[PDB]
Amino acid sequence: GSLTEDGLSYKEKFVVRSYEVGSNKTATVETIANLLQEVGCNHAQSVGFATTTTMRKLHLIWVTARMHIEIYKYPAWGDVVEIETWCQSEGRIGTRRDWILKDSVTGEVTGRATSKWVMMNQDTRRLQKVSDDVRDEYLVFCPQEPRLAFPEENNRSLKKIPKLEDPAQYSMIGLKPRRADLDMNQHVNNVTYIGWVLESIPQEIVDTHELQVITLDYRRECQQDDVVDSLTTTTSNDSQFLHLLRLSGDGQEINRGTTLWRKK
Amino acid sequence: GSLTEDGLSYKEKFVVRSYEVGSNKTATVETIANLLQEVGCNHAQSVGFATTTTMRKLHLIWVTARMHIEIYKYPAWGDVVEIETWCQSEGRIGTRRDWILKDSVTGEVTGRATSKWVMMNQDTRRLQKVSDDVRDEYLVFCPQEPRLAFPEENNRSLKKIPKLEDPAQYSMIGLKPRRADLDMNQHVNNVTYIGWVLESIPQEIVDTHELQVITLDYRRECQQDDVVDSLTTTTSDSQFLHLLRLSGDGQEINRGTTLWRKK
Ligand SMILES: Oc1ccc2cn[nH]c2c1
Ligand SMILES: Oc1ccc2cn[nH]c2c1
Ligand SMILES: Oc1ccc2cn[nH]c2c1
């Protein structure tokens, strides 16, 4: 991978691996989300990082508040997918990281993603508005004029998500992360939550439809010793669902989301 | 990746990804096992295949009976690992696939693996002795003289593994595969079983030791709706005996042994 000519975005090519594909003979949404995370990590390393010096001094970290992914065409095993990523400050609310996925051979856009990140103290877990000092240190690596993967005036990436009411139409109970679901700092990887949300989609939908859109809100972390319940209700050719992840015991919410599926 | 000059083995380089590393900032054993599987798939595609023409129509498939992995040095995030793989027929018993892992920069051997594969009818699940017709269509892609990743006389890769007796010292119960744990044919990937075996190793061992050797025997496949119990007992470096069995009736799916070195 490499930073582009202006040094304001980062591009990388990936060849889809045999173990990365699902029952459709194409890359799963979890493989895509992992590649978005990988290109994001390489972009941060190429520019000196995704904590800055000031964040490390104040015990501050970036945490994902929302992830929105839209896939038009999933790459097959052996295909080359090219991913471009960039960041932008959104005032004092937080930062936004965007991605554009392309078929490396034809140059056609096959997917796009956008994520909202908030600043949090590592220890207290208290969210805070972005300070001007921290902002200045990020701005030199971001384009100054808006560059959005989802420009549209009424787009799906910014819609409010309601809380699923009991009883859920479908559910997958007792979901536990294993050690491979944890990252280098023993925290559950954000991609595992996508897998858990999709667990409550019935097999019939998986067999006859392809996941086209997923929007996921992150409210709370799931610990290594936590147990999760995944709940889904149909809200709708296309099928739409409302999703809720909550702790098995007391029902504390960890995530809420929406998915949109198109007939195969 | 590419077949070597003689076309009798296959080599491929992989750059370790950020999400592929664990708590010690190096590639997990599950990442390694996935790369061995990936280089094995690419070798089969490059020579005209993971099933022959005669095996197809006769509804025959290759299934893993044993996997033995030894890691001396795990690659870190950004490191380049070079993997060479080859196959050899072992008479009418089955086939063997071997791997050698190297640091691509220094050329030093950082790991090695060996796997035993048996022939099974995909429908009845009955194991079969390898027919001479199938043997012939495979021997043109394998070296004729023995080439072993584990040459040593009666080494760790060929030792018999006993059945763990109850009560187990440690256990992780109620383990279920999710859709990401299934492959392109909706079968649980062989790597998930490695993850499940290691789940019953206590966190204290994980924090103070590194996994150096794992030998795993496959007895029965776990279905998408099956629930598994992972059991471990210390037999000793630290050494453990492992058993994976169905939550309910206790039917055995796997047995194994691991060897860990102090960090
Ligand atoms: O559970 C699921 C269902 C659908 C998809 C698509 N990619 N990953 C999935 C997992
Ligand atoms: O057929 C293709 C080829 C490459 C890519 C990349 N994303 N989706 C694809 C589909
Ligand atoms: O549960 C475990 C424990 C140790 C390792 C090392 N790689 N992957 C593991 C999983």
Ligand SMILES: Oc1ccc2cn[nH]c2c1
């Ligand atoms: O430090 C290294 C560098 C590359 C490889 C490959 N396997 N292990 C390694 C360790």
